Write an enzyme that holds these catalytic residues in place. Structure first.
Site, PDB file in Angstrom:
ATOM      1  N   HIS A 113      14.087  83.418  24.667  1.00  0.00           N
ATOM      2  CA  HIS A 113      13.833  83.666  26.230  1.00  0.00           C
ATOM      3  C   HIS A 113      15.242  83.597  26.744  1.00  0.00           C
TER       4      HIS A 113
ATOM      5  N   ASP B 236      26.599  91.356  52.845  1.00  0.00           N
ATOM      6  CA  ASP B 236      26.858  90.078  52.004  1.00  0.00           C
ATOM      7  C   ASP B 236      28.051  90.161  51.120  1.00  0.00           C
TER       8      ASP B 236
ATOM      9  N   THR C 145      15.749  76.829  29.545  1.00  0.00           N
ATOM     10  CA  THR C 145      14.997  75.734  29.862  1.00  0.00           C
ATOM     11  C   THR C 145      15.729  74.800  30.887  1.00  0.00           C
TER      12      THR C 145
ATOM     13  N   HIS D 229      10.541  79.614  18.807  1.00  0.00           N
ATOM     14  CA  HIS D 229      11.805  80.208  18.308  1.00  0.00           C
ATOM     15  C   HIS D 229      11.693  80.662  16.916  1.00  0.00           C
TER      16      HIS D 229
ATOM     17  N   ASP E  40      25.957  87.895  56.509  1.00  0.00           N
ATOM     18  CA  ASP E  40      27.526  87.689  56.704  1.00  0.00           C
ATOM     19  C   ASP E  40      27.639  87.508  58.440  1.00  0.00           C
TER      20      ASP E  40
ATOM     21  N   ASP F 108      26.405  85.355  48.942  1.00  0.00           N
ATOM     22  CA  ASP F 108      25.948  83.962  48.883  1.00  0.00           C
ATOM     23  C   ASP F 108      24.106  84.196  49.371  1.00  0.00           C
TER      24      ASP F 108
HETATM   25  C1  LIG Z   1      19.028  77.983  48.685  1.00  0.00           C
HETATM   26  O1  LIG Z   1      18.830  76.659  49.610  1.00  0.00           O
HETATM   27  C2  LIG Z   1      19.961  75.908  49.471  1.00  0.00           C
HETATM   28  C3  LIG Z   1      19.720  74.497  50.148  1.00  0.00           C
HETATM   29  O2  LIG Z   1      19.343  74.464  51.560  1.00  0.00           O
HETATM   30  C4  LIG Z   1      20.922  76.684  50.504  1.00  0.00           C
HETATM   31  O3  LIG Z   1      22.247  76.234  50.015  1.00  0.00           O
HETATM   32  C5  LIG Z   1      22.808  75.475  51.369  1.00  0.00           C
HETATM   33  O4  LIG Z   1      23.730  76.342  52.243  1.00  0.00           O
HETATM   34  C6  LIG Z   1      24.463  75.948  53.270  1.00  0.00           C
HETATM   35  C7  LIG Z   1      25.209  77.194  53.690  1.00  0.00           C
HETATM   36  O5  LIG Z   1      25.852  77.808  52.843  1.00  0.00           O
HETATM   37  C8  LIG Z   1      25.418  75.027  52.578  1.00  0.00           C
HETATM   38  O6  LIG Z   1      26.000  74.292  53.985  1.00  0.00           O
HETATM   39  C9  LIG Z   1      27.583  73.993  53.660  1.00  0.00           C
HETATM   40  O7  LIG Z   1      27.678  72.689  52.916  1.00  0.00           O
HETATM   41  C10 LIG Z   1      29.010  72.164  52.998  1.00  0.00           C
HETATM   42  C11 LIG Z   1      28.810  70.814  52.488  1.00  0.00           C
HETATM   43  O8  LIG Z   1      28.074  70.915  51.308  1.00  0.00           O
HETATM   44  C12 LIG Z   1      27.990  69.569  50.547  1.00  0.00           C
HETATM   45  O9  LIG Z   1      26.907  68.824  50.902  1.00  0.00           O
HETATM   46  C13 LIG Z   1      25.531  69.049  50.837  1.00  0.00           C
HETATM   47  C14 LIG Z   1      24.689  68.146  51.221  1.00  0.00           C
HETATM   48  O10 LIG Z   1      24.321  66.884  50.700  1.00  0.00           O
HETATM   49  C15 LIG Z   1      25.379  69.249  49.125  1.00  0.00           C
HETATM   50  O11 LIG Z   1      24.103  69.697  48.552  1.00  0.00           O
HETATM   51  C16 LIG Z   1      26.774  70.297  48.633  1.00  0.00           C
HETATM   52  O12 LIG Z   1      26.539  70.546  47.163  1.00  0.00           O
HETATM   53  C17 LIG Z   1      27.081  71.784  46.640  1.00  0.00           C
HETATM   54  O13 LIG Z   1      28.333  71.553  45.989  1.00  0.00           O
HETATM   55  C18 LIG Z   1      28.383  70.559  44.812  1.00  0.00           C
HETATM   56  C19 LIG Z   1      29.879  70.876  44.466  1.00  0.00           C
HETATM   57  O14 LIG Z   1      30.594  70.473  45.134  1.00  0.00           O
HETATM   58  C20 LIG Z   1      27.331  70.885  43.793  1.00  0.00           C
HETATM   59  O15 LIG Z   1      27.134  69.877  43.049  1.00  0.00           O
HETATM   60  C21 LIG Z   1      26.175  71.411  44.498  1.00  0.00           C
HETATM   61  O16 LIG Z   1      25.369  72.285  43.306  1.00  0.00           O
HETATM   62  C22 LIG Z   1      26.207  72.532  45.713  1.00  0.00           C
HETATM   63  O17 LIG Z   1      26.747  73.568  45.160  1.00  0.00           O
HETATM   64  C23 LIG Z   1      26.370  74.901  46.077  1.00  0.00           C
HETATM   65  O18 LIG Z   1      26.870  74.933  47.100  1.00  0.00           O
HETATM   66  C24 LIG Z   1      28.128  75.216  47.535  1.00  0.00           C
HETATM   67  C25 LIG Z   1      28.431  75.292  49.146  1.00  0.00           C
HETATM   68  O19 LIG Z   1      27.996  74.188  49.552  1.00  0.00           O
HETATM   69  C26 LIG Z   1      28.723  76.431  46.610  1.00  0.00           C
HETATM   70  O20 LIG Z   1      30.095  76.462  46.739  1.00  0.00           O
HETATM   71  C27 LIG Z   1      28.175  76.422  45.132  1.00  0.00           C
HETATM   72  O21 LIG Z   1      28.504  77.735  44.515  1.00  0.00           O
HETATM   73  C28 LIG Z   1      26.798  76.154  45.018  1.00  0.00           C
HETATM   74  O22 LIG Z   1      25.930  77.197  45.241  1.00  0.00           O
HETATM   75  C29 LIG Z   1      27.976  69.714  49.260  1.00  0.00           C
HETATM   76  O23 LIG Z   1      28.423  68.677  48.507  1.00  0.00           O
HETATM   77  C30 LIG Z   1      29.883  72.252  54.471  1.00  0.00           C
HETATM   78  O24 LIG Z   1      31.180  71.914  54.066  1.00  0.00           O
HETATM   79  C31 LIG Z   1      29.467  73.744  55.062  1.00  0.00           C
HETATM   80  O25 LIG Z   1      30.242  73.504  56.400  1.00  0.00           O
HETATM   81  C32 LIG Z   1      31.133  74.768  56.411  1.00  0.00           C
HETATM   82  O26 LIG Z   1      30.388  76.025  57.153  1.00  0.00           O
HETATM   83  C33 LIG Z   1      30.027  75.999  58.519  1.00  0.00           C
HETATM   84  C34 LIG Z   1      29.163  76.962  59.233  1.00  0.00           C
HETATM   85  O27 LIG Z   1      28.100  76.300  59.586  1.00  0.00           O
HETATM   86  C35 LIG Z   1      31.372  75.599  59.213  1.00  0.00           C
HETATM   87  O28 LIG Z   1      31.037  75.394  60.853  1.00  0.00           O
HETATM   88  C36 LIG Z   1      32.176  74.364  58.970  1.00  0.00           C
HETATM   89  O29 LIG Z   1      33.317  74.552  59.520  1.00  0.00           O
HETATM   90  C37 LIG Z   1      32.477  74.438  57.593  1.00  0.00           C
HETATM   91  O30 LIG Z   1      33.562  75.276  57.196  1.00  0.00           O
HETATM   92  C38 LIG Z   1      34.534  74.329  56.421  1.00  0.00           C
HETATM   93  O31 LIG Z   1      34.730  74.565  54.870  1.00  0.00           O
HETATM   94  C39 LIG Z   1      34.963  75.853  54.466  1.00  0.00           C
HETATM   95  C40 LIG Z   1      34.836  75.933  52.999  1.00  0.00           C
HETATM   96  O32 LIG Z   1      35.523  74.997  52.298  1.00  0.00           O
HETATM   97  C41 LIG Z   1      36.248  76.511  55.099  1.00  0.00           C
HETATM   98  O33 LIG Z   1      36.339  77.889  54.909  1.00  0.00           O
HETATM   99  C42 LIG Z   1      36.173  76.190  56.644  1.00  0.00           C
HETATM  100  O34 LIG Z   1      37.459  76.737  57.158  1.00  0.00           O
HETATM  101  C43 LIG Z   1      36.107  74.786  56.994  1.00  0.00           C
HETATM  102  O35 LIG Z   1      37.048  73.897  56.590  1.00  0.00           O
HETATM  103  C44 LIG Z   1      28.397  74.198  55.017  1.00  0.00           C
HETATM  104  O36 LIG Z   1      27.415  73.557  56.170  1.00  0.00           O
HETATM  105  C45 LIG Z   1      24.507  73.952  51.658  1.00  0.00           C
HETATM  106  O37 LIG Z   1      25.619  73.094  51.424  1.00  0.00           O
HETATM  107  C46 LIG Z   1      23.939  74.618  50.881  1.00  0.00           C
HETATM  108  N1  LIG Z   1      23.338  73.413  49.874  1.00  0.00           N
HETATM  109  C47 LIG Z   1      23.100  73.442  48.587  1.00  0.00           C
HETATM  110  C48 LIG Z   1      22.240  72.153  48.005  1.00  0.00           C
HETATM  111  O38 LIG Z   1      23.645  74.435  47.939  1.00  0.00           O
HETATM  112  C49 LIG Z   1      21.038  77.952  49.879  1.00  0.00           C
HETATM  113  O39 LIG Z   1      21.684  78.869  50.913  1.00  0.00           O
HETATM  114  C50 LIG Z   1      19.640  78.748  49.667  1.00  0.00           C
HETATM  115  N2  LIG Z   1      19.995  80.102  49.124  1.00  0.00           N
HETATM  116  C51 LIG Z   1      19.276  81.138  49.821  1.00  0.00           C
HETATM  117  C52 LIG Z   1      19.526  82.640  49.264  1.00  0.00           C
HETATM  118  O40 LIG Z   1      18.737  81.043  50.780  1.00  0.00           O
HETATM  119  C1  LIG Z   2      16.842  70.293  32.649  1.00  0.00           C
HETATM  120  C2  LIG Z   2      16.320  69.208  33.368  1.00  0.00           C
HETATM  121  N1  LIG Z   2      16.394  69.140  34.955  1.00  0.00           N
HETATM  122  N2  LIG Z   2      15.441  68.197  35.146  1.00  0.00           N
HETATM  123  N3  LIG Z   2      14.783  67.761  34.089  1.00  0.00           N
HETATM  124  C3  LIG Z   2      13.903  66.252  34.046  1.00  0.00           C
HETATM  125  C4  LIG Z   2      12.722  67.322  33.737  1.00  0.00           C
HETATM  126  C5  LIG Z   2      11.838  67.879  35.013  1.00  0.00           C
HETATM  127  C6  LIG Z   2      10.670  68.305  34.903  1.00  0.00           C
HETATM  128  C7  LIG Z   2      10.021  68.834  36.086  1.00  0.00           C
HETATM  129  F1  LIG Z   2      10.629  68.534  37.099  1.00  0.00           F
HETATM  130  F2  LIG Z   2       9.481  69.730  35.935  1.00  0.00           F
HETATM  131  F3  LIG Z   2       8.953  67.882  36.275  1.00  0.00           F
HETATM  132  C8  LIG Z   2       9.789  68.250  33.784  1.00  0.00           C
HETATM  133  C9  LIG Z   2      10.765  67.738  32.593  1.00  0.00           C
HETATM  134  C10 LIG Z   2      11.767  67.288  32.790  1.00  0.00           C
HETATM  135  O1  LIG Z   2      12.764  66.706  31.662  1.00  0.00           O
HETATM  136  C11 LIG Z   2      12.296  66.736  30.491  1.00  0.00           C
HETATM  137  C12 LIG Z   2      13.093  66.305  29.355  1.00  0.00           C
HETATM  138  N4  LIG Z   2      13.066  65.084  28.494  1.00  0.00           N
HETATM  139  N5  LIG Z   2      14.121  65.221  27.803  1.00  0.00           N
HETATM  140  C13 LIG Z   2      15.002  66.488  27.886  1.00  0.00           C
HETATM  141  O2  LIG Z   2      15.768  66.907  27.357  1.00  0.00           O
HETATM  142  N6  LIG Z   2      14.134  66.947  28.986  1.00  0.00           N
HETATM  143  C14 LIG Z   2      14.794  68.531  29.434  1.00  0.00           C
HETATM  144  N7  LIG Z   2      15.462  68.295  32.746  1.00  0.00           N
HETATM  145 CA   LIG Z   3      26.678  86.337  52.811  1.00  0.00          CA
HETATM  146 ZN   LIG Z   4      13.742  77.832  23.796  1.00  0.00          ZN
END
Ligand SMILES: *[C@@H]1O[C@H](CO)[C@@H](O[C@@H]2O[C@H](CO)[C@@H](O[C@@H]3O[C@H](CO[C@H]4O[C@H](CO)[C@@H](O)[C@H](O[C@H]5O[C@H](CO)[C@@H](O)[C@H](O)[C@@H]5O[C@H]5O[C@H](CO)[C@@H](O)[C@H](O)[C@@H]5O)[C@@H]4O)[C@@H](O)[C@H](O[C@H]4O[C@H](CO)[C@@H](O)[C@H](O)[C@@H]4O[C@H]4O[C@H](CO)[C@@H](O)[C@H](O)[C@@H]4O)[C@@H]3O)[C@H](O)[C@H]2NC(C)=O)[C@H](O)[C@H]1NC(C)=O
Ligand SMILES: Cc1nnn(Cc2cc(C(F)(F)F)ccc2OCc2n[nH]c(=O)n2C)n1
Ligand SMILES: [Ca+2]
Ligand SMILES: [Zn+2]
Ligand SMILES: Cc1nnn(Cc2cc(C(F)(F)F)ccc2OCc2n[nH]c(=O)n2C)n1
Ligand SMILES: [Cl-]
Ligand SMILES: [K+]
Ligand code: NA
Length: 805
Positions: A420, A683, A159, A265, A691, A687
């Site tokens: 599920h 890869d 969910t 369920h 690579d 990710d």
């Molecule tokens: C699906 O779509 C998504 C969204 O487009 C794709 O994910 C993006 O991929 C990008 C490339 O991997 C990535 O860009 C990097 O981001 C770093 C900064 O990130 C922060 O800011 C963003 C924007 O607001 C934010 O969304 C991020 O959020 C992540 O982290 C928090 C927790 O910390 C989580 O709450 C959140 O869920 C999210 O986690 C996910 O992503 C991270 C990686 O960011 C993973 O670790 C997790 O497992 C999880 O999946 C961040 O808060 C930025 O710092 C990077 O920059 C480095 O790389 C460049 C290359 O251009 C280099 O030039 C720089 O020098 C730099 O390197 C430095 O840091 C390195 C590591 O510490 C170090 O080795 C070096 O030496 C340097 O110091 C980079 O630009 C982008 O953040 C994510 N976005 C999201 C939302 O995930 C995804 O790829 C798609 N999937 C497919 C299959 O296509």
């Molecule tokens: C997890 C999670 N991630 N995002 N949401 C918010 C949410 C998003 C949608 C969307 F995006 F499809 F439109 C629909 C319903 C949603 O929440 C309903 C809800 N009410 N109370 C409670 O426990 N839940 C889970 N829940």
């Molecule tokens: Ca890779």
């Molecule tokens: Zn269920």
């Protein structure tokens, strides 16, 4: 602590959440123990129920009532949803004919049609046909609007990962909600369905739709409803918000139903007890549509009816126990049920070994109902690895089964008949999509698509720029009447070189031999045109792929195939060839068994060498264009060029050889020709993305030849299979795969048998979208076709699933 002695008078379901310790009157207050004293009394009125009756018509307004049948209710925005039906002789929305909504027909002051997301938990795709008799409002939305036969959820088909994927367009691995329960080792914190840690923002990554709207000046209703707020009241609240003044009224709203999942369920997906929950959801839909019609919004609002996942038959007696496999079952923590996630009970114990745990779970019982994987070996289509909250050891559980640690975990915790969470390709996990409104198409069926695509569309529906996500923006344009997003092809970054003959045979010292020196101006001008690209129109049907990153590479032409050869990785990035229906399979002649030939277009320094393969006792080699499919004995020599060679474990060569010798020909016969593009994928950091060279963890011993983690193929033909692949006038048909390049075939339990009993099964498991391959290679395919780009985008997102009808 909340000083809950403020009041909810005039604040009932306030849109902006006020901060503790002032008391709250917004939806979520119940869930935080923070509602003002009078919240129930003022905001959760129930007196007289939810429907107007004949006697209530034109009554004296009694503020105590749940909803009103008084004369002023319309202008107050708080009538019962059936008011006009009972008291004004109006018809229910469901009884009205459907009429095309060519343009939004909205009240003055509406800047854009509102979007209402009606989300249903556990709503399996086949309920649309199977419950059709008891769901008239839903069936009208479905047949009058735009619908898909089903919508593919994300893995795991739980969910919270799916709802948050709907909201963000992100894979769970990126948004961070990777299951209904999780451990984050960096936080050192745990997330659970019950309890308080789930409310901390640090679990929730990406940018959900409500935040995208807000940041861009579009107001949003709440997406989260407290479970104690009944459905009728959620509807009335949405309808009330819709009566707000222009400056205060949200443009996007969500309704959520816990049904039919809750009953599923208990009773199983088709239990006789399931009819009533489906009737009740339909009645709620009815209440919304009647309410909108009262407010003259029924030809103004876009409505999305969307599920998070389906539901499967699963019972207590179908549980595999890890105690039947492991002896150290107390040294592990299992996240259990319809998927398994294993980690060490203690970070202090370095006697815990993931390798021995895996081997102890691999192919141990003849009917074994789960398969262990290191996360990076899971099918790439699951996109389920790149998060510290996903444990290294994963168990993919067969549909209809559970996994648990010890039997005591089940009987001391049969209750359940449905569950599920399984592989998102499974038919029972599929869910629903219907769009209805001015911006959706009229009476249109669209192909099944993935839930990750919807965020982009909801953004388009609201005129928002989507945050970066995993959708392919434009691939769902075909759902929409207007508001389409006109995508453009990415620009090529690296142009190819086209080398001619530049090196003499004796400049190479590669340790390769070939039995090939046997000596004509008919057949010398012939080979010449073939090396300049004469049959290139035959073998490269959709243009060459564009290289979307900075690199050095050569286009190489041949009679039977064309390749884009990387001077950096020393092998093709892609190899393209067409196999007609008529084509003949031949064998590799005995004298050419070990033949590898220097390529006189490519320098020794940018070539592989045979010596490395001799020295590397683990690593052998294969070819991307298969020698078995050469068009002539003479063309066959081209297939043994060092530039067509790639590194392959002997265990993987079994898989690859069967694909190339048997399966390509089978597909050509069945589909009337196929065009094949194959290549390596690297890869190493799992990710999902190509690579760089500095990320490669393994080379062929004593060389600079990088070892791929995967091999792909993209297999294209004419959707109208009465036309051959090489002369197709209309839409295309594709299937693709990303096979893991593994030194063993431990994944396939029947691999000591003939390849005809297991290889195709493996390939099916590793089915892929062209878009998955694009991420993994930095290539962009189908650049030159006669089709619209939107259509190509839909084709690139297609997944061939191998599930029955
Ligand atoms: C699906 O779509 C998504 C969204 O487009 C794709 O994910 C993006 O991929 C990008 C490339 O991997 C990535 O860009 C990097 O981001 C770093 C900064 O990130 C922060 O800011 C963003 C924007 O607001 C934010 O969304 C991020 O959020 C992540 O982290 C928090 C927790 O910390 C989580 O709450 C959140 O869920 C999210 O986690 C996910 O992503 C991270 C990686 O960011 C993973 O670790 C997790 O497992 C999880 O999946 C961040 O808060 C930025 O710092 C990077 O920059 C480095 O790389 C460049 C290359 O251009 C280099 O030039 C720089 O020098 C730099 O390197 C430095 O840091 C390195 C590591 O510490 C170090 O080795 C070096 O030496 C340097 O110091 C980079 O630009 C982008 O953040 C994510 N976005 C999201 C939302 O995930 C995804 O790829 C798609 N999937 C497919 C299959 O296509
Ligand atoms: C997890 C999670 N991630 N995002 N949401 C918010 C949410 C998003 C949608 C969307 F995006 F499809 F439109 C629909 C319903 C949603 O929440 C309903 C809800 N009410 N109370 C409670 O426990 N839940 C889970 N829940
Ligand atoms: Ca890779
Ligand atoms: Zn269920
Ligand atoms: C996005 C996002 N950011 N923070 N949250 C935490 C949060 C979680 C819930 C829950 F768990 F009921 F779904 C409700 C309300 C919440 O706020 N969700
Ligand atoms: Cl889970
Ligand atoms: K070898
Ligand atoms: Na095996």
């Amino acid at each position: 602590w909340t000083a809950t002695s403020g009041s909810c008078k005039g604040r009932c379901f306030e849109l902006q959440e006020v901060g503790p310790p002032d008391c709250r009157c917004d939806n979520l207050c119940k869930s935080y123990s923070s509602c003002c004293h009078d919240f129930d009394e003022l905001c959760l009125k129930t007196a007289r129920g939810w429907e107007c009756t004949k006697d209530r018509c034109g009554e004296v307004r009694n503020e105590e009532n749940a909803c009103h049948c008084s004369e002023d209710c319309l202008s107050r925005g708080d009538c019962c949803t059936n008011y006009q039906v009972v008291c004004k002789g109006e018809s229910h929305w469901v009884d009205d004919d459907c009429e095309e909504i060519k343009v939004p027909e909205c009240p003055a002051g509406f800047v854009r049609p509102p979007l209402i997301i009606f989300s249903v938990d556990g709503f399996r795709a086949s309920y649309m046909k199977k419950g059709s008799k008891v769901m008239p409002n839903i069936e009208k939305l479905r047949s009058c609007g735009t619908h898909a036969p089903y919508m593919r959820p994300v893995y795991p088909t739980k969910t919270f990962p799916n709802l948050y994927t709907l909201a963000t367009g992100l894979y769970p691995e990126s948004h961070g909600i990777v299951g209904n329960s999780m451990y984050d080792p960096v936080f050192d914190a745990s997330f659970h369905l019950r309890g308080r840690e789930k409310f901390n923002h640090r679990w929730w990554g990406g940018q959900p739709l409500w935040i995208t709207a807000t940041k861009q000046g579009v107001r949003a209703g709440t997406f989260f409803w407290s479970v104690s707020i009944p459905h009728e009241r959620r509807i009335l609240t949405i309808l009330q918000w819709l009566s707000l003044p222009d400056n205060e009224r949200p443009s996007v709203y969500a309704f959520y139903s816990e049904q039919p999942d809750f009953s599923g369920h208990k009773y199983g997906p088709f239990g006789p007890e399931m009819t009533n929950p489906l009737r009740e959801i339909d009645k709620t839909v009815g209440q919304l549509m009647d309410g909108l019609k009262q407010l003259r919004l029924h030809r103004c609002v876009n409505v999305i009816f969307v599920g998070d996942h389906g539901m499967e038959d699963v019972t207590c007696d179908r549980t595999e126990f890890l105690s039947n496999y492991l002896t150290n079952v107390d040294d592990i923590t299992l996240v259990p049920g319809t998927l398994g996630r294993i980690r060490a009970k203690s970070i202090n114990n370095s006697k815990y070994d993931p390798k021995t745990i895996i081997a102890a779970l691999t192919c141990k019982k003849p009917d074994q109902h789960f398969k262990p994987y290191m996360k990076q070996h899971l099918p790439k289509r699951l996109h389920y690895a790149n998060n510290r909250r996903i444990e290294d050891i994963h168990l993919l559980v067969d549909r209809r089964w559970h996994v648990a640690r010890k039997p005591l975990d089940v009987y001391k915790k049969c209750f359940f008949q449905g569950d599920h969470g399984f592989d998102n390709k499974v038919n029972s996990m599929q869910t629903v999509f219907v769009g209805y409104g001015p911006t959706f198409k009229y009476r249109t069926k669209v192909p099944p698509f993935e839930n990750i695509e919807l965020y982009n569309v909801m953004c388009d529906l609201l005129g928002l720029k989507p945050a970066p996500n995993n959708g392919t923006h434009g691939s769902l344009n075909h759902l929409l009447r207007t508001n389409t997003f006109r995508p453009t092809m990415p620009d090529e970054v690296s142009r190819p070189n086209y080398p001619g003959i530049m090196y003499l045979q004796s400049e190479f010292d590669l340790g390769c031999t070939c039995d090939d020196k046997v000596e004509n101006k008919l057949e010398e001008l012939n080979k010449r045109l073939h090396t300049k690209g004469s049959t290139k129109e035959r073998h490269l049907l959709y243009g060459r792929p564009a290289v979307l990153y900075r690199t050095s590479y050569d286009i190489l032409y041949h009679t039977d195939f064309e390749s884009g050869y990387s001077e950096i990785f020393l092998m093709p990035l892609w190899t393209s060839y067409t196999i007609s229906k008529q084509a003949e399979v031949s064998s590799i002649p005995e004298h050419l068994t070990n033949c590898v030939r220097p390529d006189v277009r490519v320098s020794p320094g940018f070539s592989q060498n045979c010596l490395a393969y001799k020295n590397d006792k683990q690593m052998s080699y294969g070819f991307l264009f298969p020698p078995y499919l050469s068009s002539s004995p003479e063309a066959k020599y081209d297939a043994f060029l060092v530039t067509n060679m790639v590194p392959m474990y002997p265990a993987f060569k079994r898989v690859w050889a069967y694909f190339q010798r048997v399966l390509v020909k089978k597909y050509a016969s069945e589909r009337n020709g196929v065009n094949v593009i194959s290549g390596p994928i690297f890869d190493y950091n799992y990710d999902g993305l190509r690579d760089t060279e500095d990320e490669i963890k393994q080379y062929v011993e004593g060389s600079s030849i990088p070892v791929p983690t995967h091999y792909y193929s993209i297999i294209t033909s004419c959707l109208d299979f009465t036309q051959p692949a090489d002369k197709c006038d209309g839409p295309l048909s594709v299937s693709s795969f990303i096979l893991p390049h593994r030194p063993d075939n431990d994944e396939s339990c029947n691999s000591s048998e003939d390849e005809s009993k297991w290889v195709e099964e493996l390939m099916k498991m590793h089915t892929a979208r062209v878009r998955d391959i694009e991420h993994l290679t930095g290539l962009d395919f189908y650049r030159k076709t006669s089709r619209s780009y939107s259509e190509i985008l839909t084709l690139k997102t297609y997944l061939h699933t191998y599930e029955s009808e």
